[PDB]
Amino acid sequence: INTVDTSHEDMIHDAQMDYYGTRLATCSSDRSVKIFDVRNGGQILIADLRGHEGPVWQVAWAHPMYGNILASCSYDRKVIIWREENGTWEKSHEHAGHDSSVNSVCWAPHDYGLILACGSSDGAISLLTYTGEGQWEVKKINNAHTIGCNAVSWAPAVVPNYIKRFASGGCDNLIKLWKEEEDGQWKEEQKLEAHSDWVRDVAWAPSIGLPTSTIASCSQDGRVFIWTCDDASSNTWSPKLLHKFNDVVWHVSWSITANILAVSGGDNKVTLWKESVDGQWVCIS
Amino acid sequence: GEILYRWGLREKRAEVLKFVSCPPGVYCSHCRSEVRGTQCAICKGFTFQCAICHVAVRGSSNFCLTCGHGGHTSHMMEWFRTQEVCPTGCGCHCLLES
Amino acid sequence: MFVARSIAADHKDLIHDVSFDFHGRRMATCSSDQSVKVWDKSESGDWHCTASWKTHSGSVWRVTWAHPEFGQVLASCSFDRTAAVWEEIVGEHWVKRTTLVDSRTSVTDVKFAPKHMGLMLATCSADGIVRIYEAPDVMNLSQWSLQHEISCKLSCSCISWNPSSSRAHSPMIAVGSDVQIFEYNENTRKYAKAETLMTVTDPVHDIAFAPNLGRSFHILAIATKDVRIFTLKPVTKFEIHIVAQFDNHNSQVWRVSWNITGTVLASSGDDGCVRLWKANYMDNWKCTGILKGNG
Numbered sequence: 001i002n003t004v005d006t007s008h009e010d011m012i013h014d015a016q017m018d019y020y021g022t023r024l025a026t027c028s029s030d031r032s033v034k035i036f037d038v039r040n041g042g043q044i045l046i047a048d049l050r051g052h053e054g055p056v057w058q059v060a061w062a063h064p065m066y067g068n069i070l071a072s073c074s075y076d077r078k079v080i081i082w083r084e085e086n087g088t089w090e091k092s093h094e095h096a097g098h099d100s101s102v103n104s105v106c107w108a109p110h111d112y113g114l115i116l117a118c119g120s121s122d123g124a125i126s127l128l129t130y131t132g133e134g135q136w137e138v139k140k141i142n143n144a145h146t147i148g149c150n151a152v153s154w155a156p157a158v159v160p161n162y163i164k165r166f167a168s169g170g171c172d173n174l175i176k177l178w179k180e181e182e183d184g185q186w187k188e189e190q191k192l193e194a195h196s197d198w199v200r201d202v203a204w205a206p207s208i209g210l211p212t213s214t215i216a217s218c219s220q221d222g223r224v225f226i227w228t229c230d231d232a233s234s235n236t237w238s239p240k241l242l243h244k245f246n247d248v249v250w251h252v253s254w255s256i257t258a259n260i261l262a263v264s265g266g267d268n269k270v271t272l273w274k275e276s277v278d279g280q281w282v283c284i285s
Numbered sequence: 286g287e288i289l290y291r292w293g294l295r296e297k298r299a300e301v302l303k304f305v306s307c308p309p310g311v312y313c314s315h316c317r318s319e320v321r322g323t324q325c326a327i328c329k330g331f332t333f334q335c336a337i338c339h340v341a342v343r344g345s346s347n348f349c350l351t352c353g354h355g356g357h358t359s360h361m362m363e364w365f366r367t368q369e370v371c372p373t374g375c376g377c378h379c380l381l382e383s
Numbered sequence: 384m385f386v387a388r389s390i391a392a393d394h395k396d397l398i399h400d401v402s403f404d405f406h407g408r409r410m411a412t413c414s415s416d417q418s419v420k421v422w423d424k425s426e427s428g429d430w431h432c433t434a435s436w437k438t439h440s441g442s443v444w445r446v447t448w449a450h451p452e453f454g455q456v457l458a459s460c461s462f463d464r465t466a467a468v469w470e471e472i473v474g475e476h477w478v479k480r481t482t483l484v485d486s487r488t489s490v491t492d493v494k495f496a497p498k499h500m501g502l503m504l505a506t507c508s509a510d511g512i513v514r515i516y517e518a519p520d521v522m523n524l525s526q527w528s529l530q531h532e533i534s535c536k537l538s539c540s541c542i543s544w545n546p547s548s549s550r551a552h553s554p555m556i557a558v559g560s561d562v563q564i565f566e567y568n569e570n571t572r573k574y575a576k577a578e579t580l581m582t583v584t585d586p587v588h589d590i591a592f593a594p595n596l597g598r599s600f601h602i603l604a605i606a607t608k609d610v611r612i613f614t615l616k617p618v619t620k621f622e623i624h625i626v627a628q629f630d631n632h633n634s635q636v637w638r639v640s641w642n643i644t645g646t647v648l649a650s651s652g653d654d655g656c657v658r659l660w661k662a663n664y665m666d667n668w669k670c671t672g673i674l675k676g677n678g
């Protein structure tokens with residue numbers, strides 16, 4: 001059980017490793033993004049990143065497809081990408097085309113390309129599609145949500161030349177699905193209106209081939225819903241329920257084959273759920 | 286295959302992905318033109334001549350993008366092992382520019 | 384000064400002709416039971432056969448190999464009035480690409496062409512029908528086209544090519560009699576009847592030119608009851624001569640073959656004796672070793 005002795009200033013805010021499991025990333029309020037290498041166990045410092053306009057919330061490592069890339073979504077108008085080229089960590093690009101403070105950064109499936117979504121707390125969205133010269137293509141939409149929209153997640157690349165989809169939510173006690181049309185502008189579709197107080201985590205679930213596409217939700221109502229769909233043609237997003245824990249629920253993460261839905265919240269602990277044959281979700285640890 | 290890549294064992298990735306059912310310039314020495322392939326079209330001759338054994342090659346072949354002198358992969362191991370000079374005497378520091 | 388040795392090659396029946404490759408790796412024995420045996424040479428020095436098949440109807444007479452620059456190509460001529468090209472494709476099989484039947488008699492000899500003139504094959508028939516065939520396409524070996532032909536006016540037995548690779552030279556072919564020289568002119572684009580040495584009324588078994596190596600006079604060897612080595616000095620009109628008459632074979636000489644350096648000539652006779660002839664300090668020719676057929 002390897003441990004990384006924290007050395008930042010303020011309380012840590014996030015952690016996300018690399019694809020092969022070789023590096024780290026530590027967003028914080030100390031503005032430090034100090035990356036640690038964990039090869040064979042131990043602490044180094046390949047980068048002691050600095051420079052933002054506010055505390056950083058969420059980082060998101062991109063695919064090795066396109067080289068070492070890290071993203072930051074500080075309480076700012078900063079979306080900085082840090083390319084770490086020529087064997088040295090360094091800044092590469094920033095974009096301030098959003099008035100409010102972003103709270104989500106979720107990379108797209110690698111089959112499409114290199115697309116980033118980062119929705120701020122204004123009710124807008126953005127796609128930073130890479131072009132092939134060294135410039136982005138940032139497009140947006142004027143409105144998506146009433147007051148929040150702080151969580152965004154992507155949908156597995158399936159089907160036959162691709163029909164892109166992704167999920168958002170966090171403002172109107174709601175969650176919406178955006179399927180972009182053949183023109184290029186994000187249309188809209190149904191919105192899953194079955195939540196109570198204030199949602200925070202809006203993640204999705206990896207696909208394997210089974211037509212049962214699922215999606216979770218963690219909120220301030222204390223409830224967690226594991227939606228389900230028999231197919232994509234019936235759209236019967238039937239809300240089930242797993243628990244009604246007392247405190248606030250913060251984050252939900254899936255496993256590589258969706259046999260775990262680990263939940264962390266205000267109780268300052270980690271719970272490791274898993275569903276049985278009867279369909280009821282039970283704890284393990 | 287995606288999981289196998291993620292683990293760090295990557296020959297097995299190609300081995301597994303081999304089973305899927307659904308699908309997935311060099312100058313000529315005679316007419317002095319750009320040839321697309323191991324075989325020419327005008328003279329119908331060999332376009333790539335090995336710069337070590339002076340024999341025609343059609344398989345795996347390294348090269349320099351700058352100086353433009355290439356040969357068999359094993360030959361480009363055997364020469365480039367120690368001495369860093371083009372065996373055709375063009376002065377290229379091929380290992381520095383390739 | 385030659386030390387004999389024996390090679391562990393298993394051959395059931397008799398063998399007619401053996402020809403080496405360019406590098407010294409892979410003979411092409413083909414004789415007896417109408418078969419072609421393309422052996423090889425391992426790293427340890429041992430020889431292991433790695434090919435076999437059945438040739439045309441007539442007995443296989445000669446087998447010749449081709450340059451490494453145009454793939455692995457063979458060329459055999461049998462008594463069935465057919466010349467076989469046996470190019471290897473993809474692996475350890477051999478597949479045909481052409482077969483010429485333009486000779487009304489049995490094919491007597493098949494010799495390739497020098498690398499500098501392209502990919503040419505010359506075939507000699509028993510009645511004196513000698514034709515030169517060119518294959519300009521190199522990516523395809525299934526195509527052929529005749530270039531030119533000459534009138535032997537006799538019974539051809541063996542032909543030889545001039546290996547000279549200089550720009551200021553004219554290719555030629557000399558045909559045995561059982562004894563002339565041609566000259567492929569430039570403007571006319573045809574073979575000719577320039578000159579012919581008249582010193583041997585005996586039957587001729589096999590002629591063989593000597594490599595150039597940059598000297599200013601070519602050497603020709605004629606196989607007869609007496610081993611003959613001659614010289615030609617260009618001044619076109621030549622300066623034909625004769626500088627050797629060694630006849631210690633005590634039989635009929637079988638074949639004459641030349642070394643890479645154009646210095647040592649090997650001759651074999653009908654008395655089962657293989658003798659090598661080398662030069663001396665005063666530019667004289669003397670024997671330098673005799674080996675028995677048994678060993």
Ligand SMILES: [Zn+2]
Binds near residue numbers: 327
């Ligand atoms: Zn060409």
Ligand SMILES: [Zn+2]
Binds near residue numbers: 340
């Ligand atoms: Zn080579």
Ligand SMILES: [Zn+2]
Binds near residue numbers: 349371
């Ligand atoms: Zn070079």
Ligand SMILES: [Zn+2]
Binds near residue numbers: 349352
């Ligand atoms: Zn080079």
